[PDB]
């Protein structure tokens, strides 16, 4: 009977809530009340990139922290050199509606996807010298929202059919599928060890997935609206999420509960991108009101504002070495801050 | 080293030339989003002229690009934001049907979206012949679904085609007024709606969308100059 299972699920959720309450005595702000603030951060634009036509949805830093990639609605994929602002590759796209891109850790591949429900893999080390599509992954139902490389042969993708998938590039088959979300999965982030990955969906829930077994380990529910961005803490035992209720929240894998929220009265717009710094002390979050904000993760006090963007900020990324942070936006401009 | 910089500069120059050509091609075409329901009959409209379907048609040597929604889910909250730069949204609704209230709610949601505030909407009240024969039959009423239809009269500025009884003219103009009531509630000058009484097999739909796109572009240019 449906009623008995509904009641059992309700009491199980109540028990989980009671356990989480019992496993919490002091907040994050209550233990860091004595450390000194980082002070005001006067970051300013160092490079500006003006090669795109339409708005920008995604960008991914290379593991060398020098190369870059960007996707725009004019069906153009462009690879930049952040040091000299020189375009290296310009990849035309079969479908002009792309909502994500990813740059392979080895630097030999780049991926993109969007409303065509297909993830396209491009090889940059071709023998002919001309970049061409190598593999097309066409097993998803809804629009593809985010993709991340594990290695040159495995890529994990999250789509609008409320499922996340693990792909085998060589065969093209969908090796493992992840189910459980009741809404559009908007973004995902990979753990530093590439053993787990979290996903933020449109049902205001974040789930911790296990790549090897394919099951769901934990579910985090503290947000009020749909989640847009997600990113692991550099330690690997925490992550931050950004939703449309103008709040950034920090969760913990071990405590299985929320620790800190980053909200201000003057902020009533959505959040589109979230990223950390190398030490994890600074949390950077792009907002809808044309500017980004820098949050002191250990004190929840804003420490800087990056207000150089004309239109909505939609993508954000921090280099592996942490030297610079890049911020694309809907005005077809990428600005590298430092 | 100098040779590496020379190579990167040469590659950048070539890529910039190709991007200039792509910009010249891109600025010429106009993008249209074809939106509707299964009963709306938009498939017949597409036939007259995967995850997403696109069609290319030219009217007076002008390139238009129409993107059918395709095989997506029924939740349009997130992917509708990608179409905030299109010239217009071709909203196709079946006027013979409660699907009409659902279409009205969808139109209201589209019209009041923050990202879609600048985008204009072209309205096609399809299935006109079916509505005409249904009203002549009289088996199904509109007053029962819409209680306001009893106290509604045909507008004095209406221009019905000859040989058409007032019974269907009043009903179709009532539906058009119901849509325009949502249309004129907000969006004061930012964007406009263009209702058209289109049949399924009408050959003038291309002309209608052509003229509506021309009007939208003219009004945008006037708005930029603060002349409107």
């Amino acid at each position: 009977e449906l009623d008995q299972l509904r009641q059992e699920a309700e009491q199980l959720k109540n028990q989980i809530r009671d356990a989480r309450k019992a496993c919490a005595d002091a907040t994050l702000s209550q233990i860091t009340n004595n450390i000194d603030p980082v002070g005001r951060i006067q970051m300013r634009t160092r490079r500006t990139l003006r090669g795109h036509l339409a708005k920008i949805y995604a960008m991914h830093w290379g593991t060398d922290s020098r190369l870059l990639v960007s996707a725009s609605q004019d069906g153009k994929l462009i690879i930049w050199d952040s040091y000299t602002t020189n375009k290296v590759h310009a990849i035309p796209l079969r479908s002009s509606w792309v909502m994500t891109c990813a740059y392979a850790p080895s630097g030999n591949y780049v991926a993109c996807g969007g409303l065509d429900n297909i993830c396209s893999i491009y090889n940059l080390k071709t023998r002919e010298g001309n970049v061409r599509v190598s593999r097309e992954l066409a097993g998803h139902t809804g629009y593809l929202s985010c993709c991340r490389f594990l290695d040159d042969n495995q890529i994990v993708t999250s789509s609008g059919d409320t499922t996340c998938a693990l792909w085998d590039i060589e065969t093209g088959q969908q090796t493992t599928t992840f189910t459980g979300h009741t809404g559009d999965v908007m973004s995902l982030s990979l753990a530093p060890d590439t053993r787990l990955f979290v996903s933020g969906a449109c049902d205001a829930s974040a789930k911790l997935w296990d790549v090897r077994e394919g099951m769901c380990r934990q579910t985090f529910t503290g947000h009020e609206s749909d989640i847009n961005a997600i990113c692991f803490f550099p330690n690997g035992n925490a992550f931050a999420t950004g939703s449309d209720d103008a709040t950034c929240r920090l969760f913990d894998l071990r405590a299985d509960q929320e620790l800190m929220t980053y909200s201000h009265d003057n902020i009533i717009c959505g959040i589109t991108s979230v990223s950390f710094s190398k030490s994890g002390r600074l949390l950077l979050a792009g907002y809808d009101d044309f500017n980004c904000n820098v949050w002191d993760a250990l004190k929840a006090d804003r420490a800087g504002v990056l207000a150089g963007h004309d239109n909505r900020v939609s993508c954000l990324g921090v280099t592996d070495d942490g030297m610079a942070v890049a911020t694309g936006s809907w005005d077809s401009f990428l600005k590298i801050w430092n | 080293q100098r040779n590496e910089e020379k190579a990167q500069r040469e590659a950048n120059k070539k890529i910039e030339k190709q991007l200039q050509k792509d910009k010249q091609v891109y600025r010429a075409t106009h993008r249209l989003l074809l939106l509707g329901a299964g009963e709306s009959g938009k498939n017949t409209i597409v036939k007259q002229m995967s995850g997403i379907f696109e069609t290319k048609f030219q009217v007076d040597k002008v390139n238009f690009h129409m993107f059918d929604v395709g095989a997506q889910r029924d939740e349009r909250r997130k992917w509708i934001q990608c179409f905030n730069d299109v010239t217009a949204i071709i909203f196709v609704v079946a006027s013979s049907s409660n699907r009409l209230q659902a279409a009205l709610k969808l139109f209201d949601s589209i019209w009041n979206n923050k990202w879609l505030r600048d985008t204009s909407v072209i309205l096609f009240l399809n299935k006109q012949d079916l509505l005409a024969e249904k009203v002549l039959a009289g088996k199904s009423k509109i007053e029962d679904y819409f209680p306001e239809f009893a106290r509604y009269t045909t507008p004095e500025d209406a221009t019905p085609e000859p040989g058409e009884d007032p019974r269907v003219t009043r009903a179709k103009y009532f539906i058009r007024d119901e849509f325009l009531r949502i249309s004129t509630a907000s969006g004061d000058g930012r964007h406009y709606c263009y209702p058209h009484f289109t049949c399924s097999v009408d050959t003038e739909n291309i002309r209608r969308v052509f003229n509506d796109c021309r009007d939208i572009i003219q009004r945008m240019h006037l708005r930029q100059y603060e002349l409107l």
Epitope: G183, D244, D245, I268 | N112, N113, K114
Partner: nanobody
């Protein structure tokens, strides 16, 4: 998390009066537009009514105009629905859906299936 639970409903003879209450938890109830959605047996989801953040603007579907009234009190985080004359075709399941985003006028996907922010619903029969 977000939890919407409906109250009221049951079996009432035609012409009777019914009261529907929705209890909201897990979010600031004063920042979201609220909706009522009805699913007739054998048919799809149908929208019934909506009320603004402060209750200033109220809208109803045509079939129930002047017969159902909706109300909300932000202090108690409760959404109401008053029924006056249950016609025989009103038998269906009623959900108190929520507008997906705060401080906005557009409420997409409320009548769509498998919507995230919807209650279990109550069954009314006549």
């Amino acid at each position: 998390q977000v939890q919407l639970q409906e109250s009221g409903g049951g079996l009432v003879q035609p012409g009777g009066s019914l009261r529907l209450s929705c209890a909201a938890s897990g979010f600031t109830f004063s920042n979201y537009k609220m909706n009522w959605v009805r699913q007739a047996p054998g048919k799809g989801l149908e929208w019934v009514s909506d009320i603004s953040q402060s209750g200033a603007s109220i809208s109803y579907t045509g079939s129930v105009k002047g017969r159902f009234t909706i109300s909300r009190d932000n202090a108690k985080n409760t959404l109401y629905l008053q029924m006056n004359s249950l016609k025989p075709e009103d038998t269906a399941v009623y959900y108190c859906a929520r507008c997906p985003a705060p401080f906005t006028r557009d409420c997409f996907d409320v009548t769509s299936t498998t919507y995230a922010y919807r209650g279990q619903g109550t069954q009314v029969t006549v």
